[PDB]
């Protein structure tokens, strides 16, 4: 059968078609019945059109009879069926239609029988209410017209060629004219016949199916209209056909919108077809710019792509305001749309388009700096660079021009760059260098875990080599020029991390290393900004790599720097801490400055040869004895002592360490914890926060986990926290994290960090799990802010001990009920928001026990037994008959009554009987209703 052969996909369609054409020539009715049965069977209909039906019945009655005989196992029709066999079927169906027209193009198509029969059947099935028939019949008619457009295009080519010959004949002047004139007449009858067939499909199927309820049928029609106007633009690119695309651009479904954009991009690839699309662009330019910010990002990508195509053909159509909206898409969170916007920006301000400031890309670098400054959406250039990376690689990787704009002097006639423009260029250069050296996009703009290809690795190596050679000489010069500016110095000091250090010894550029080291030493001795000092310390660590031969030189420089800093600290402290006298603000400024620098270098560098614990302990001890020590000195002294104790623990790993070292470390760590506990009660909030962070960290490092992993020599160094410290740490969290509901978003991140620290101590069994009750009770009230941290803590604790977590959860709900009865009092309404909110946390907590219902039997049973005793605890002072105080609490417990397995249900009621008399079993709404609910929850 025809359908079966097309589905099998074994024979060539031309053989299938030629076989049928041979059969049609023998008897036409037999062949047309088979062609008709094909379209009906390609919809899934297992019925047959008998010759008697075709000869006597009408198309409408046949479709009715076929609907009744459509055996159906699923609502899936061939074109909906998923699978590779069915993907082959779609292309096989479309190809059969094309081949049939191609083969019957010169003779059968003009017989007034076949095409009319096919178009009539297709139009009838395109009006059917069965999606199977309509979808299939629409696809067939749409493909038939694409094929008929081809015959019209071929007929037009022949008539133009024939007409050209007729002009020549009359010019040269004949039976030649007569025979040529007959060709013209014959081709006109043929062209008229094809146009009539095409209008029948357009006015019978397309006019109605472009508005079909099902989006799939609408997209089929939109796709085909694009093909026709691209194929035969001289008869299909008028506004009477383009009007349909404009209306469908406003479609609710994005699949259909994507097809409209793709159809219009096909027309803009040819620049000749411009005069026709000009009026349409003018009317719908607004909608296309609006589709850039589309809910579906895929449609957005195509809209920016189509605007880029419009920019190429005609630039005046888009006004600056419209272009500005697209420029704002460079800083988008979706890389695909940002990359598409980068291409539009490249083709609008950069693509349009000697060494140094005179270099060819100098103007384009200045143009990019001007754009970043005129767009106050972002303060860093990371996303602008990532978006324009695949398009402006030459400009972005031209670091000689960028370095010449920052170091070389302005040419006569060139206006200088302002400090803001120079700061902008340094941000752009650092960003280009980072993406070149580390071939990964910024956060949010990629997975960041792609295996690099061979070319990617070769590109990375050549980029790093070029970066190292150029900035090995330039970085010293740049730091000397912008040393006073903290923002500029911070950015510039990050460059050495992206360098091939071996280039210094393979390239004899060691004199440049000496200069880089001097400027870092110079900046440290002049700046007090924490970020400048963090950069200097981290740059030194990168340079201090024992895998590179340059290590000896950089170790000498680091040692010389710490020698000077430590010497000054010791001589300043001897006079600052002198018993008596008064502390000049000058002395404290000098002390804070030197402590700040040492704390920075102590985080990444050892510095243990310069014993600093004694100095830091004296400063902190004086604050506890006097009380007037500047807050900032206290913060830096606490941080520095943390690093002193941490660097000593790293050296003890070597068995070469004696018991004196372990015993000295224990005494030093124990003294520090007491100093931190004192500042946790300080009046300055910053000092309280610093002490908490350092204490939480030191308690994790010096915990029982220091003995795990075969490190049993560190058993003497384990520090267990006392109940006093545990209570003080909880007080800080309940006062500085759960407070009364730009700086807001920053304070959120700081408070989230502080909460994570305490939660880490609970999940690593450093502090008791009963302390988590306060955090657990604040789940719902602070869900938008700390919910993730609390949920992680609850999950982690459930793995440590489900039974203990169950008890911790009940205490939190027990605590919130106590607070309501402290305000609303015992006589409170059971419809109040506070009770209702408390009832809501119970529902959420119940949801977290569902996992492993057969493994959480003991935890849920404990919850009930723990809460039953809280409800029946304080007896009614009025009388031993009036309901018990807090009896209302069991209304909160009723929520967990579902998780109890039926066998566990019976046992918990037995526990209830012990706290309930048969007299207590009296029916009243007088607070006796609460208990009735919990009893009824467990009874069924």
């Amino acid at each position: 059968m025809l359908f079966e052969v097309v589905k099998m996909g074994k024979s060539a369609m031309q053989s299938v078609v030629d076989d049928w054409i041979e059969s049609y020539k023998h008897d036409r009715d037999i062949a047309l019945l088979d062609l008709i049965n094909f379209f009906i069977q390609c919809s899934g209909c297992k019925g047959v059109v008998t010759a008697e039906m075709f000869r006597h019945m009408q198309n409408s009655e046949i479709i009715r009879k076929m609907t009744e005989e459509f055996d159906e196992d699923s609502g899936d029709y061939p074109l909906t069926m998923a699978g590779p066999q069915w993907k082959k079927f779609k292309s096989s169906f479309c190809e059969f239609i094309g081949v049939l027209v191609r083969q019957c193009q010169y003779s059968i198509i003009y017989d007034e029988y076949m095409m009319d029969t096919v178009i009539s059947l297709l139009t009838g099935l395109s009006d059917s209410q069965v999606r199977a028939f309509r979808h299939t019949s629409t696809l067939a008619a749409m493909k038939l017209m694409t094929a008929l457009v081809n015959v019209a295009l071929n007929l037009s080519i022949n008539m133009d060629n024939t007409q050209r010959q007729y002009e020549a004949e009359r010019n040269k002047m004949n039976e030649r004219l007569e025979l040529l004139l007959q060709k013209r007449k014959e081709l006109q009858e043929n062209q008229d016949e094809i146009e009539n067939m095409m209008n029948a499909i357009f006015k019978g199927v397309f006019v109605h199916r472009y508005r079909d309820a099902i989006a799939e049928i609408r997209a089929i029609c939109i796709e085909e209209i694009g093909i026709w106007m691209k194929m035969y633009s001289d008869a299909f690119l008028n506004d009477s056909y383009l009007k349909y695309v404009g209306w469908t651009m406003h479609d609710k479904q994005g699949e259909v919108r994507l097809k409209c954009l793709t159809a219009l991009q096909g027309l803009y690839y040819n620049k000749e077809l411009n005069s026709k699309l000009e009026l349409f662009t003018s009317r719908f330019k607004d909608r296309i710019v609006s589709m850039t910010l589309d809910k579906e990002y895929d449609v957005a990508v195509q809209a920016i792509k189509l605007l880029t195509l419009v920019l190429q053909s005609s630039e005046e159509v888009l006004t600056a305001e419209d272009c500005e909206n697209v420029y704002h898409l460079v800083y988008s969170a979706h890389r695909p749309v940002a990359v598409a916007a980068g291409e539009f920006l490249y083709k609008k301000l950069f693509s349009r388009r000697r060494r140094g400031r005179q270099g060819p890309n100098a103007n384009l670098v200045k143009t990019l700096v001007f754009f970043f400054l005129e767009s106050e959406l972002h303060e860093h250039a990371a996303y602008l660079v990532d978006s324009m990376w695949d398009c402006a690689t030459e400009l972005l990787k031209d670091w000689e021009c960028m370095n010449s704009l920052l170091l070389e002097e302005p040419l006569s006639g060139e206006e200088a760059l302002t400090d803001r423009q120079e700061s902008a260029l340094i941000e752009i250069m650092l960003c280009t260098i980072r993406q070149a050296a580390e071939c990964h996009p910024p956060v949010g703009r990629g997975t960041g875990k792609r295996v690099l290809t061979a070319k990617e690795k070769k590109t990375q190596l050549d980029d790093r080599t070029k970066i190292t050679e150029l900035f090995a000489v330039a970085l010293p010069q740049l730091l000397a020029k912008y040393s006073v500016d903290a923002e500029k110095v911070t950015n510039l000091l990050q460059l050495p991390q992206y360098f091939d250090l071996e280039i210094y010894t393979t390239g004899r550029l060691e004199k440049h290393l000496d200069a880089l080291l001097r400027q870092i030493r110079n900046i440290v001795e002049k700046h007090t900004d924490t970020d400048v000092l963090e950069a200097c310390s981290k740059t030194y660590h990168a340079l201090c790599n024992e895998e590179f031969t340059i290590f000896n030189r950089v170790d000498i420089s680091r040692s010389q720097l710490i020698d000077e800093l430590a010497d000054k600290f010791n001589r300043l402290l001897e006079d600052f801490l002198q018993e008596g006298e008064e502390p000049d603000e000058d002395d404290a400024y000098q002390v804070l400055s030197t402590l700040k620098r040492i704390t920075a270098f102590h985080n990444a560098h050892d510095l243990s040869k310069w014993d600093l614990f004694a100095c830091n302990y004296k400063l902190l001890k004086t604050g506890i004895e006097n009380g007037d020590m500047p807050e900032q000195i206290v913060i830096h002294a606490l941080q520095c002592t943390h690093y002193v104790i941490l660097w000593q623990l790293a050296k003890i790993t070597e068995s070469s360490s004696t018991k004196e070292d372990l015993l000295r470390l224990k005494k030093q760590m124990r003294v520090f914890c007491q100093i931190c506990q004192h500042y946790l009660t300080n009046v300055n909030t910053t000092v309280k926060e610093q002490a908490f962070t350092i204490l939480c960290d030191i308690l994790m490092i010096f915990s029982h986990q220091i003995m795990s992993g075969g490190r049993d020599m560190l058993e003497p160094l384990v520090y267990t926290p006392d109940s006093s410290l545990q209570s003080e740490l909880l007080s800080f969290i309940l006062d500085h994290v759960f407070i009364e509901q730009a700086s807001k978003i920053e304070a959120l991140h700081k408070r989230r960090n502080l909460l994570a620290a305490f939660c880490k101590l609970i999940v690593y069994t450093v502090v008791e799990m009963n302390t988590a009750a306060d955090i657990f009770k604040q789940y719902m009230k602070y869900y938008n802010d700390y919910g993730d941290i609390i949920k992680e803590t609850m999950s982690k604790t459930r793995q440590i001990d489900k039974i203990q977590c169950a008890k911790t959860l009940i205490l939190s709900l027990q605590q919130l009920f106590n607070e309501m009865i402290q305000e609303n009092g015992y006589n409170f309404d059971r419809s109040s928001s506070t009770f209702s909110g408390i009832k809501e946390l119970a529902r959420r907590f119940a949801l977290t026990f569902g996992l492993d219902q057969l493994k959480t039997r003991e935890a849920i049973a404990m919850l009930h037994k723990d809460g039953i005793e809280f409800a029946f605890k304080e007896p009614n002072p009025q009388g031993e008959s009036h309901p018990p105080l807090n009896l209302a609490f069991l209304d909160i417990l009723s929520e967990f009554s579902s998780k109890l397995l039926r066998q566990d249900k019976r046992t918990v009621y037995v526990y209830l009987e012990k706290f309930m008399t048969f007299q207590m079993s009296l029916r009243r709404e007088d607070v006796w209703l609460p208990l009735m609910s919990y009893r009824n929850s467990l009874l069924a």
Binding site: G75, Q129, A213, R257, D294, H380, Y383, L646
Partner: protein, 73 residues
């Protein structure tokens, strides 16, 4: 029967006219990527996994950092 028979085969002219008037349901605003360098770093080190894996006080040497990461089990 399981045959997908559809009573409404086309869209109404009021629906088409309404779509040509309002397109708010299918448009949206701009999602800007981390605007400040600190917000970029918080996107990298501000998630529950990173918070429960990294120290509260930044450690810039991996030797000092290993002392904390060794205790995270």
């Amino acid at each position: 029967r399981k045959l997908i028979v559809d009573s409404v085969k086309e869209l109404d002219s009021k629906t088409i006219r309404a779509q040509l008037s309002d397109y708010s349901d299918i448009v949206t605003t701009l999602d800007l990527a981390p605007p400040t360098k600190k917000l970029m770093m918080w996107k990298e080190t501000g998630g529950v996994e990173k918070l429960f894996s990294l120290p509260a006080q930044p450690l810039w040497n991996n030797r000092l950092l290993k002392l904390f990461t060794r205790c995270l089990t």
